[PDB]
Design a protein around this ligand. Structure first.
Ligand code: GDX
Ligand code: CL
Ligand code: MG
Length: 377
């Protein structure tokens, strides 16, 4: 089996450790790191490779991501390049991906996925305990989209559709490398595409729970990712899903305390950020949205406002966005950012602040309400 770690700008020791771990695992045939560009991290790994290959008996290689897609050159190009390397330079049966920034990696992650594949699953997704204000792109953008657009499918049930930890069988990887929609997503949209396409193709999915968290590197640092993940959904909005998928979730443990109590984003800076980067055009664009959202987002010019951005309003807003949002347009991008920011704040003050369990229950019930609403059409 091949284990891939896509990396951009990571601390070498961090990644090297993970490579060590995967290299030492009895079911791993080869390790490939897939870099954005030849940098500090890249050279550090190119160098350590031999010492590690001798120690473990496992080939270890670094390669550069090639431009296989047509959006921003980002993580999608990396993953896809690894897909190509996997299929064209190796004859291994299964491929894993794990983020490079991870600091809680262990052999048991590899084991759990390998054993689930042995059981018969086509794709294995690792999911993790999250803090109640973590993964607001996942919930408010991805899962919501899937719920509103394909309410009868397994799509909105996928726990972490944006997660980069997974395992594919050779044929699944091949199908994905063949898909033009997949190939195109060179940017942060890659993960959404793997999720969408594997489910749409009727691959059988298992999600395994990693009880210890996912420890990696820690609101507007997220802006590109927000737009690109929203773009991905938008680009798929006309696709049809023509078959069911076997889909099963390892039962989750109670969240660890240090994760439930993890700090979270900066509320003050977020509120302040809602009042910044306005332009008249942003203000004319709001004309496209419903009155409460329009009035709401406009008030943010003078002071932060978010009570208006409830569940229903978010869904309204989502539909307007689906139809009018233009990736690449700086005013649309900022506007999506503000809009999503208010939703996040709303969820934080009216739901998350009521407690971990409450917030979790709320999120699942939200998706359900969205599914039912969409199915009535
Ligand atoms: N080769 C390559 N690697 C990249 C690039 N951009 C990021 N990476 C690597 O991709 C991983 C994820 O990057 P990170 O900055 O840690 O993102 P984050 O942890 O916030 O993202 C989570 O949600 C994303 C969504 O989608 C996922 O892509 C990601 O894997 C995580 O599940 C890390 O290993 C990065 O080094 C790129 O342009 N090229
Ligand atoms: Cl997220
Ligand atoms: Mg990260």
């Amino acid at each position: 089996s091949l284990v891939v770690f896509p990396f951009k700008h990571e601390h070498p020791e961090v990644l090297l450790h993970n490579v060590r771990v995967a290299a030492a695992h009895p079911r791993v045939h080869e390790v490939l790191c897939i870099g954005y560009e030849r940098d500090q991290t890249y050279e550090a790994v190119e160098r350590a490779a031999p010492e590690i290959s001798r120690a473990t008996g496992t080939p270890v290689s670094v390669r550069l991501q090639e431009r296989l897609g047509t959006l921003r050159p980002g993580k999608g190009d990396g993953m896809n390049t690894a897909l190509r390397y996997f299929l064209e330079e190796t004859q291994w049966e299964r491929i894993h991906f794990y983020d490079a920034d991870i600091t809680s990696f262990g052999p048991d992650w590899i084991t759990k996925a390998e054993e689930a594949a042995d059981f018969g699953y086509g794709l294995v997704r690792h999911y993790f305990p999250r803090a109640s204000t973590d993964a607001m792109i996942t919930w408010m953008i991805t899962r919501t989209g899937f719920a509103l657009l394909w309410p009868h499918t397994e799509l909105s049930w996928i726990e972490q559709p944006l997660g980069g930890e997974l395992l594919m069988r050779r044929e699944v990887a091949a199908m994905l490398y063949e898909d033009e929609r997949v190939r195109r997503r060179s940017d942060w949209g890659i993960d959404t595409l793997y999720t969408f396409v594997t489910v749409a193709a009727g691959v059988s999915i298992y999600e395994c729970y990693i009880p210890e968290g996912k420890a990696h590197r820690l609101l507007d640092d997220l802006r590109t990712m927000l737009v690109e993940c929203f773009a991905a959904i938008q680009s798929l909005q006309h696709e049809v899903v023509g078959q069911p998928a076997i889909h099963r979730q390892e039962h989750p443990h109670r969240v660890p305390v240090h994760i439930a109590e993890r700090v979270g984003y900066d509320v003050e800076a977020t509120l302040h950020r809602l009042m910044q980067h306005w332009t008249p055009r942003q203000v004319e664009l709001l004309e496209l949205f419903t009155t409460p959202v329009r009035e709401g987002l406009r008030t943010c010019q003078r002071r932060p406002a978010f009570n208006f951005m409830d569940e229903m309003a978010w869904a309204a807003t989502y539909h307007v966005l689906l139809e009018h949002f233009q990736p690449g347009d700086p005013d649309w991008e900022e506007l999506l950012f503000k809009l999503w920011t208010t939703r996040v704040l709303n969820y934080t003050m009216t739901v998350a602040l009521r407690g971990y369990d409450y917030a979790q229950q709320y999120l699942y019930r939200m998706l359900g309400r969205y599914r039912y609403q969409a199915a009535l059409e």
